[PDB]
Design a protein around this ligand. Structure first.
Ligand code: ADP
Ligand code: BEF
Ligand code: BEF
Ligand code: MG
Ligand code: MG
Lengths: 415, 409
RNA sequence: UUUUUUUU
């Protein structure tokens, strides 16, 4: 008997289930769940709820739900300050426990006992090392994207491993003009993560992008999808993004390998510039002087932790939009991240995919994510591709890789 | 028994030692019972004089910011030895009496690692007579490693001397930080005498811990997770500590990364004057970082202050162009790194033609400068990439720039 | 008014 489980089930099964208990005529869907929960409480049976914690300024908090993009919701579960102090809870902590309907003079479900804090024992949460105190590091463990199934979509993953490898805790960018292939390449990334790295906690944050891409992503990726389309204001974009990044930080505190696929971070950087207080100083392109400190900390949250776990963020960026702002935002994030995979519009207009700008792509300290021979073969491959043009490079590399199933067999053939 | 020593020792020691006798409470109790025994207590830190007259010995673990374990310094002690912000002080300390919240300083044993009575009367930093760098700080190791190529090309392109005021100018991902890391290793390799300080301002956290583990010196960091107000304060303490050591005839070298983002931090804190330069830079924002960078200088009296700081260009923001060109009119050494060279994966990605050091004849022998001048004319007609691929390969044949000059003739 | 836009 769980609240969010009742919210997921269709209304048809809820109305039928409510009639089995013997209730009055079945009112809006939200009322069906509420009336069913109350009747179950009358029997003496226990009730359960869950959600990500958000501590308000007064000291208490609520358990936001994913169906509201972790925003204020009618089914939020109140968390008393005493409960927060007892287990050292902070914003982002996923909480599950027994709940009770609101009494007379109350408007929210209350939390009686917390069973699980971040998918673990509540006691283990009391003693922990905070995210701000974790010792940072360069990416060590390689997150190989290559399927190896000889698929035609696998070409994008294979070229990615050769141009700019991705490790745990990476802070990368999929930089390209509109319609170059950023979103689908991000989708291609989500598929390889779900297949090759099911151990990682995969999240897909969609900020100020197309709505049909939201449903396409949530029915394609094997993970959680938090979205805030361009139908939403910048105020919502920021708040939604803040909740996701804090939930990631909390899981990293539990030695988890979290991956955040952001699209787009340039749209998110614009959102911050919309809500930022005017400083009297504006950068070239119309970007406030203090507007990029917030998005830089969001993107900068991604990091490799020595104590355990990691936070990876692969976000898409826009360039050559005619607006200098996007060049400033991109260059600022490049001075923050450690990996950039460029996509060329010139290649995309020839319908050559993946339309990857090989020379401009790359990863920092890639020797820590590749074997000694792998790096030496990638190093030689770049020297050969560099003199080529943008299009000739991809047409050459894709035709060579298509001859074999894996890059390892391609390297053996390369000899 | 020193307080700093007791803060570095693990908690297990405080337990075992405590039986023989929070971490802030235990250390406080152990030291408190050391005074009743009559035995002396010691502590250390960097002094910061507040506006009222008294001061506090800040700790390096708190990045020289306000700390719970800071040591109060009486105003009388400041007058008796002419102490100023930045002085490193060690001495006997006493646990706070009732009504006090901090340990107190009884008497100073060492002021900047010297005797207090001798630091009382010395020529101030603002009174030292400046000069152009006339003492060469050779970067080349001569071990034959691939990492030495950066140092060798650096010696040929832009020699660094004691008191230099240089810049590692380049766009993002060109190789500024690792260029800076290579410089730190050569200073610890060839110049153990110089006091090496590494100031990391508004940069990546992973580069902080990485720096700390490969550099033989002090690492003061303030990552981009920190406010601009913290950047300034931390940078103010480091530059003042450097000035104090220079007053003691010591060769201090500060490797900053990045100074461009430090200038941004000053621009965020600076009061609005109503006049804003092109790019969003307040007309008074650059004064503070300009006197920070301009603090570096060669001193005739003895010792010097060297500052090699990285700078950003081609960021799409006219602000960084104003900042870079302003520091260029302040410094006297510039090492540019090219993005198109780094994108071809040619390291070091040094723009040979646009790099150089002022008054380089004071840092090189007459024969050495001749060969550098000849090598200059040969490389100039070449393109950026071809220049590096040419110089790197010719240096690869040799282990030392001296044997490379022998092949020249 | 400055910065942003003009503007490269
Ligand atoms: N001398 C070098 N040798 C090999 N790789 C280098 C060198 N200099 C820079 N790189 C590459 O560039 C990447 C980032 O360069 P970095 O020093 O961060 O430039 P910046 O500080 O200007 O951002 C590193 O991960 C490294 O792989
Ligand atoms: F139009 Be694309 F998604 F940048
Ligand atoms: F991104 Be670099 F460190 F400027
Ligand atoms: Mg898209
Ligand atoms: Mg750098």
């Amino acid at each position: 008997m769980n609240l969010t489980e009742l919210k997921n089930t269709p209304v048809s099964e809820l109305i039928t289930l409510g009639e089995n208990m013997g209730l009055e005529n079945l009112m809006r869907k939200q009322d069906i769940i509420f009336a069913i929960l109350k009747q179950h409480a009358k029997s003496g049976e226990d009730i359960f709820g869950d959600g990500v914690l958000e501590i308000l300024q007064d000291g208490f908090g609520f358990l936001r739900s994913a169906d509201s993009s972790y925003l204020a919701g009618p089914d939020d579960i109140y968390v008393s300050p005493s409960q927060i102090r007892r287990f050292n809870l902070r914003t982002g902590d996923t909480i599950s426990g027994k709940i009770r309907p609101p009494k007379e003079g109350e408007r929210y479900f209350a939390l009686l006992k917390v069973n699980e804090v971040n998918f673990d024992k509540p006691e283990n949460a009391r003693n922990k090392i905070l995210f701000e105190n974790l010792t940072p590091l360069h990416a060590n463990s390689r997150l190989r994207m290559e399927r190896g199934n000889g698929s035609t979509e696998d070409l994008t993953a294979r070229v990615l491993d050769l141009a700019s490898p991705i490790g745990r805790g990476q802070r990368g960018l999929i930089v390209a003009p509109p319609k170059a292939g950023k979103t689908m390449l991000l989708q291609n990334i989500a598929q390889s993560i779900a297949y090759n790295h099911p151990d990682c906690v995969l999240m897909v944050l969609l900020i100020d992008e197309r709505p049909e891409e939201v449903t396409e992503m949530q029915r394609l990726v094997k993970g959680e999808v938090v979205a805030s389309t361009f139908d939403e204001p910048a105020s919502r974009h920021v708040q939604v993004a803040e909740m996701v990044i804090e939930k990631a930080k909390r899981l990293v505190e539990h030695k988890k390998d979290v991956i955040i696929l952001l699209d787009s971070i340039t749209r998110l950087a614009r959102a911050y510039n919309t809500v930022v207080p005017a400083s009297g100083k504006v950068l070239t392109g119309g970007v406030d002087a203090n507007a990029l400190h917030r998005p830089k900390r969001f993107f900068g949250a991604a990091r490799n932790v020595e104590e355990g776990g990691s936070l990876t963020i692969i976000a898409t960026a826009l360039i050559d939009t005619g607006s200098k702002m996007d060049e400033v935002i991109y260059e600022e994030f490049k001075g923050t991240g450690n990996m950039e995979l460029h996509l060329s519009r010139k290649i995309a207009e020839k319908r050559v995919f993946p339309a990857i700008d090989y020379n401009r792509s790359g990863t920092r300290k890639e020797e820590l994510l590749t074997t000694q021979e792998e790096l030496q073969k990638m190093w030689i491959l770049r020297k050969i591709i560099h003199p080529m043009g943008e299009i000739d490079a991809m047409e050459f590399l894709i035709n060579k890789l298509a001859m074999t199933k894996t890059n390892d067999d391609f390297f053996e053939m390369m000899k």
